[PDB]
């Protein structure tokens, strides 16, 4: 969703 | 592969001897034999490694480890060379597009570009690494009909293992992602699939974000549904959000709260 | 291994023919799927890679088989879960020509008959195979995990420092990062039991870095637990807020019996 | 599974 970034997808 | 097997082997001061024969185990490790993956499957085996770590020690993981610097960078004009060298690799510049549309907005994948990808998502018997994650980047280019499809797919028909969960992992996100969608749009029975399929992957791990993520999602839910409590359960989440100082998360549930609540 | 290659191939859909190259033929690639023929494992990763499939990936899905230490950790998983002291105690003499691993089975069956111990010297034959590694695997650190109770501060610590900066990790796979973030965060809870600032600090710092752009929620409460705790033991009154506030994350969460037990600690040492 | 603390890694 916002997690910019961390974890390689941007949902 | 005889190389990496060497390092390993060596930097716990394992010697060839006690692990084929040495003869031949010195002999993939000089790069000279091919071995079978179940000779090095037993070698790592042996050795007290798995294969996930070993692997952990690939087109798709040089692109994702490029698109990751870049991103981090916030740095456009390199993303769009990016895109420029895999422009003949169809899902993979479609992701590359999808994915800097958030951060230059005049760059979307084309409405041709993205049936391309769902066409594919749709045909594949087994949604693992590869899938989930072209999924996860183009879910804001796919209109919600189709992305609940594509959930419903990959919910039901995806591997992992139990040394490694990173599918599970993310496929528990994306499952989360697509109902607060179907709650948006007031589609219940979808809603209500995915509750159960979320509470059955969450069952019996730590996964904290996920279950704050859900806490919040689901008492989203539970707030059309006609129970009060929902705010409470919305309002929990964003508490955790800001005692954990999770910036993003807290502003951007807080945004979602006050439109919807 | 061919059966699996050739069901995960038609899963995409895609043909023999546009994975065969100069390393392979087409009449390679299908007597290997029919397990007529093998091929190098080198080869396999090639066509894996065309799959997008990575090798890790292709073996979970070709068969619930694990490894002997994957195997080890299974069987005395559920055996501390049903508080069976028998056959731990037997699995340990079926595990007596492994010095690590029996000498780790010993450390967990204390945890549940304490009559049972590893020695001194058994501890120490495991210690000093743990300062001997470059880098740390999957291996050693469920090893310095489950046998921590029987290793000094000292050397534990020590030990710790090595985990840190020599655990190997990707982008795709953070399994050993959560671990090592993990023990970390539980040798910062004994160096602040033991009054040991200087550790305490250093750990704060490493943990700090080692949860930056990540999710990792449960090791994020319970370091706004410990962390709290530590400035507590400091005269920082904002150290029990921080303590509650991780109380509440468990609460809300519904995990009760983490609340639970954080929040016996909490009116114990508060 | 749940590891509070100590405990058996990774149970």
Known sequence: XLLVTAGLVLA | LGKTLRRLRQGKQVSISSLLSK????????????????????????????????????????????????????????????????????????????????????????????????????????????????????SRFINYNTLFLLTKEMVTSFAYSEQNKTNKTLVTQLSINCLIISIDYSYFDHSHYLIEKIEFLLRDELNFYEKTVFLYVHGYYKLKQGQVSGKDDMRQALQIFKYLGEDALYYSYKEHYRKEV
Chains 1, 4 share one sequence.
């Open chain 2, 23 to 138: 003869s031949q185990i010195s002999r993939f490790e000089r790069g000279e034999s091919e071995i079978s993956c179940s000779r090095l499957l037993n070698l790592l085996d042996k050795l007290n490694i798995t294969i996930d770590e070993f692997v952990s020690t690939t087109h798709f993981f040089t692109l994702l480890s490029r698109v990751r610097k870049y991103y981090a960078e916030k740095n456009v004009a390199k993303l769009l060379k990016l895109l420029e060298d895999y422009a003949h690799k169809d899902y993979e510049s479609t992701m590359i597009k999808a994915i800097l549309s958030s951060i230059e907005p005049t760059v979307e994948p084309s409405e041709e570009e993205v049936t391309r990808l769902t066409d594919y998502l749709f045909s594949v018997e087994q949604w693992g690494y590869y899938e989930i994650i072209l999924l996860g980047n183009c």
